[PDB]
Amino acid sequence: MFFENSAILLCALLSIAVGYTKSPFMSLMYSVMLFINSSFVLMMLGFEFLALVNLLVYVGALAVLFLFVIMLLEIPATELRAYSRGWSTLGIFVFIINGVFQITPSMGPRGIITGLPGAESITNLGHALYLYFADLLILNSLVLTVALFGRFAIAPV
Amino acid sequence: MSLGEAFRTAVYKEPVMVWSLMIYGVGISYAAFVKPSMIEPPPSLKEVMAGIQAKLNNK
Amino acid sequence: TWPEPPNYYEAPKHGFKVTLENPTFPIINPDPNITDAVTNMRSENWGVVAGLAGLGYVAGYYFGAKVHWAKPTALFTSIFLGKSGLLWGMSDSAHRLMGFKENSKEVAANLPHVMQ
Amino acid sequence: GTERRPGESGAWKQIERQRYASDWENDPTFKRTPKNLAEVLDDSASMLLLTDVWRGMAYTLGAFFDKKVTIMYPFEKGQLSPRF
Amino acid sequence: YNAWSPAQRYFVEGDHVVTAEASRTFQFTGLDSGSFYPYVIATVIATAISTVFIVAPLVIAPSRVDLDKSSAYSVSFYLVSIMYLLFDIEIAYLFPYAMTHASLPMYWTMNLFLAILVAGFAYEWGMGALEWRE
Amino acid sequence: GWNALPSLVIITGIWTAGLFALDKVQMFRENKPAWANNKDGWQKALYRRDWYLQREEETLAMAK
Amino acid sequence: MIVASILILIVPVLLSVAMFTLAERTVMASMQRRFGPQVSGISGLLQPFWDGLKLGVKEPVLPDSSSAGAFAASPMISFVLSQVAWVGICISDASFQGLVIMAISSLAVYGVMLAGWASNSKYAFLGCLRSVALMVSYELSLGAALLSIGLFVTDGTGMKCLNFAEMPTTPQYAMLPLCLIFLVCILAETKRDPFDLPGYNVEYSSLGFALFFIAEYANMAVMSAIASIYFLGGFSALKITALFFAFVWTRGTLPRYRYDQFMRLGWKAFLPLTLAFFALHASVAI
Amino acid sequence: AAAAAMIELDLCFGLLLLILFGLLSLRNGHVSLAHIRFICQCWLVMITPLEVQDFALCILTVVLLQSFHSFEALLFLLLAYIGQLYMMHSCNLVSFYVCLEAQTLCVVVLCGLLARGASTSFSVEAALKFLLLSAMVSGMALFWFSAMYQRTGSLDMVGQETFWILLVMLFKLGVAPMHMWSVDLYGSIPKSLL
Amino acid sequence: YYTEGEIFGTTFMYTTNMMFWAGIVGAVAFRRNLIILLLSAETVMLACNMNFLFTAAYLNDITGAIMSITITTIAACETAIGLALCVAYFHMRSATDVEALNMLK
Amino acid sequence: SNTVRVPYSHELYAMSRHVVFRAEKEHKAAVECKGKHDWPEDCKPESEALVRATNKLYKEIMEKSPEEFKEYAQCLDWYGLRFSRCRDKQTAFEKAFPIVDAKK
Amino acid sequence: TAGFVWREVDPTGQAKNRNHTYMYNLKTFGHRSYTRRDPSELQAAATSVEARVKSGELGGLSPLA
Amino acid sequence: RFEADEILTVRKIVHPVLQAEWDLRYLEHLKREREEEAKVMKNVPGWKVGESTTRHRWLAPLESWDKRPLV
Amino acid sequence: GLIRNIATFATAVVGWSVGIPFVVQARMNGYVERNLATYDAAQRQKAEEAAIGG
Ligand SMILES: CCCCCCCCCCCCCCCCCC(=O)O[C@@H](COC(=O)CCCCCCCCCCCCCCC)COP(=O)(O)OC[C@H](O)CO
Ligand SMILES: CCCCCCCCCCCCCCCCCC(=O)OC[C@H](COP(=O)(O)O)OC(=O)CCCCCCCCCCCCCCCCC
């Protein structure tokens, strides 16, 4: 299982790589690679539909908006102190302490867990979304309404 | 103006919107009114399988 | 281990808000439809519907007259408050029919062959 | 046909003009509003379901099955005159 | 992937099963149902082919250096991109509905969902935001 | 026209021969003409049980 | 065996792309009362191969003002996505196969936008955004059409899916307007007539350009196979040829729209129609 | 039976009717919307249950709406009120997260929309900083909710992970030393949103 | 001492923990722009979404999938609003700032 | 340890109609035991009885009508356990081996 | 609901305060419980199965040879 | 719907047979594991072979044959 | 250059794919060791409580 574990571990490398580079274009390219690789990681767990939702939303829709904003707003200033000012050593120390050594992990006292693949059922998801969590579904619709109206009101004229 | 004049001017000036609303309304109305009037209406495993075989064997 | 064979064609009968009560009154209909809810509604419910509609008409006429649009504002505000009152009244009638509220008036009217 | 419609107008000043005023009803080159049910169905079968694209498609399909005007140069030549 | 436990191998003992699984052929009707593994191999093979397409004219083609050969010969997109993002999320929400045999309360909940969608869409239509004059 | 007929015939022949060859190759890989059907969790469980029991029958055969 | 199956799939895809681009030239010529390519090989049957070999020995122009990696990556990404989508058509058994191909075709936007970012042309940046806006606008109508299609796709066990082998083998007569909208959406995705106003490959030469056109024609074949699966009762060679002939026939006889015109068409006509048809089909399916 | 949920259906129907009425009023060129504000206040009263805290919030928001004039601002305040009301009834971290995020998005958009004059860019700047600082706190809430969900197997809010959720709540109240987003907001955003 | 499934699970959890802290800290540490800060916020959301999906598979439970869909919705809405505000601020302040989208300089 | 198994999935689907008409009491006992007791040790005799009753039926069919059962099970194997693609083989097998003992 | 709760006072006072999560899950999903079988029934059933094997009306533990 | 109902009925018939076969195989595997543990820990003081961890409810194995990664 | 950047990315990916599993293996070994110490301490406490608890 070398390639599967390597594909899992690649996501953290791409997460660091998004912020490490000085080119905003390359940051977005790293993010697109990360979301494709994570969609393939989620399908190791047995999720077919939700991995496709990950791909379709984040890579298909949101990264296009990122690339339009970057390509419209970024005159090259990588020399203009993006290289000449460097980075913060305190922030790098915080990242090392919290994410490499992981002094406060999410599993807490536990250190070993057995990964278990699932079997996604979209009938169960449809039943849950439209019967058991229907109020949350409608409130998600209201949040999307806030996004649509708010963007169209905030569009620069 | 009445229903007819306003409807004809609306469908002449913008037909796709009017037809879209009509298709949506036909679906909503069929599920609300038309469907529940005409089309709407412990045995063991052995009786269920016997019924399945009986439905299969004539055709 | 071996899972249950799934029944794709049967959906669970579940409403998203669960009442967590047993009814404390006699049950006429455990699941009334909208016709059942309207046909056993009391007169106080219709009275509060008409009161809400009248208050809505008057207030909409007042507020819509500042932009010279008083009649459609009055009509819209009347319908808006009236449907709020109608939903309240239908819910009250359905709860009396299901047994969660007092239904002595409803038991002596909704069971023509089970009157006494 | 050469008739005009409110909506098929290629610009914006005339699009704004046709949807806020009925000055287009005086002009004789415009198509009139349908008056009954059958005329509404004819107008909708014009706008939806195309049928104006289909006439050009039938003409080009007839041309697909027709004769060709190409000469095979240099095995075949054109036509010239003694004054050339 | 290979199974790492006796329970994952249906309690079949021996060493023939371990080697037979590790050296199995890919089969959609064996151990690899619904597998998405051919999608990765297709990416690798097609990337190899397109790289060979890229590299080859650097060998078998003429080349001449010139300074002129190496030279160049709205907010509506923001609207389109953000609206496409929101509508794609809404269609992704509607997809678990269509993959179920829905009962009537599911239908009316879905129609309330769609109604909120189309109400916001119709507001942006009526304010003249889908007229792409600018 | 008559000049457009050979390319249109060749497209059909290419796709016919390619689909025939791909069908024979995947039929040799899977050994059943329903390998492309949708499978739910019960059908996946049935195929995985069949594979492991076939391996067990092979293991028990090489002992007698 | 998977590598063998994928290569045996890849061979007729490229052979078919060459024959499609020849057949487009010759059918477009026959509608215009001429011949089209006949000299280059007998009956012109070597013309796409000599185009490919001519571009093979053509000089690759690498502009020394662009970013070389993204410039190289854009046609590679387009070609790879087309080949992967074909593999998803023919070498998959997944439950949500149509959703997989919709996800792949939503990724195809990146080659256009990387070409727009990489090359330092003033109007390549101007046209890439227009082409992306067109593809992005018609993807939503494609998705809502898939929603309408999936309401009636059930396998033998009773599970609803988008698996292609479970689709019925008869034409879907109930969804003729949705089929027409699907075909015009295919025309809009491939930037063909009448949406061919936006080009983005103005700086590409030799085999990068060849990769761009192979990707475009392979994507057209993917969408043709998808439409034949969804509406025409199956995937076949005759249906692929007939739908390609229809697309060339439409390209012969029609003029193109302005940018705002097809934007208004896609955002005021096709999306409300597909959503209204989805609501009507959901009402029917109860 | 859905007869115990008529107030939710009434909420949704009222929003659907209010958007259409606001559209019809704007097609006439009305430069004032007091009728829309009265309908918004009626909708606020009609969706609020009969508790002391619920009606305190309702009457407070009815009074607050008299300082807002555009249709979009009224819509954003109503959809922020939905989150504010339903957070008081939240018994999990799912609904807690959604209500908090709806409120944050509404506040950000209102800070962008209502600024005028020379103070427009200052308000947009402070709204951007608030959004960035809010995103990472929302990430902390999601991360430690995922940790709690994995440890307990349920939706109970018990154990060591509640300390970080408490820190999320303290951020939302502007508690020092996580206080500087509110200090930034007070200096630029107009008085009605303050 | 431990099996292949335990290596797979512990590797997943270590990866998502480092992903979460990378998204939280790294773009601020490297003194990047607001656009890259929003991208890193999306990295944080992706780490939480992967954790919820892993737990939903681990417990055979539906709540992780519901949370996954909700996280995708909220993250995209917040990101779109933030990018619109970034564009508006850039057009308001570029006449005197040049490096206007970088507040960590 | 002893090797315990039931026939393959296509054979199980091909013989599933005879299981309820000829081994109903073992099926009932196994269902009731699994409803009452969760530990697999507590339902061992009924589990063993159901396994042996399935295997005895499988031995009966191969003695009486082996070729019809083999072609029907091969048809079910070929078409992914879809019953609607093998109606003729099903009819031939049920004609050769009746589900219930006829003319008794 | 699955994420919201509403609290109202019983007018009569004849309602008992319980955990609403436990009540909600009892109404929504139920609760399955089992018991250990009495050992005497186990040996009785095992003896009956052994007798049915020996007398010849039960088959073998495998379809193979 | 008719085809799905037939397949559901057949799956309901086959499910107890398969669960019984799983149960007997699981018991044999447990017996082999207890023999191995008794061979390993014979000299350890105080160790008990076969100690169930829970008290009331039987615990199924976490991993199973039917759940595998896709890629 | 492009070749330098592709080589550097390939080197970083391979080095990450070989180096991090050693970090994870060391962390899991430390957890196993601490868990075994906890088990032994619990057994010692149980023996002590059996000794003076009857
Ligand atoms: C201009 C506006 C006017 C509005 C008022 C007039 C319109 C009428 C109101 C709409 C219909 C009445 C209200 C709902 C009736 C439910 C009562 C009922 O039982 O009806 C059906 C109940 O079915 C439904 O239609 C349920 C509606 C579900 C609505 C789900 C969404 C609720 C709202 C969620 C919002 C979330 C909260 C947002 C903020 C956080 C089925 O009837 P039955 O049980 O007798 O039939 C049995 C049959 O086999 C089918 O069950
Ligand atoms: C914009 C336009 C949108 C168009 C929408 C079209 C909607 C079409 C609905 C078609 C319904 C299905 C076709 C008939 C099958 C019925 C099945 C059945 O009863 O089976 C028992 C039975 C089968 O016998 P069995 O062997 O006992 O199953 O079939 C019949 O009794 C069918 C008898 C023919 C009835 C034809 C009715 C035609 C009118 C239907 C309604 C049309 C108007 C709806 C909208 C009004 C305005 C809102």
Ligand SMILES: COC1=C(OC)C(=O)C(C/C=C(\C)CC/C=C(\C)CC/C=C(\C)CC/C=C(\C)CCC=C(C)C)=C(C)C1=O
């Ligand atoms: C009006 O529309 C059109 C255009 O404008 C959009 C065009 O631009 C072109 C011209 C461009 C072409 C033909 C390039 C795209 C196609 C290619 C490169 C063909 C792909 C074919 C392959 C890979 C197979 C050929 C290779 C073989 C047989 C291998 C040979 C190996 C050995 C002998 C060892 C055409 C024809 C056209 O109609």
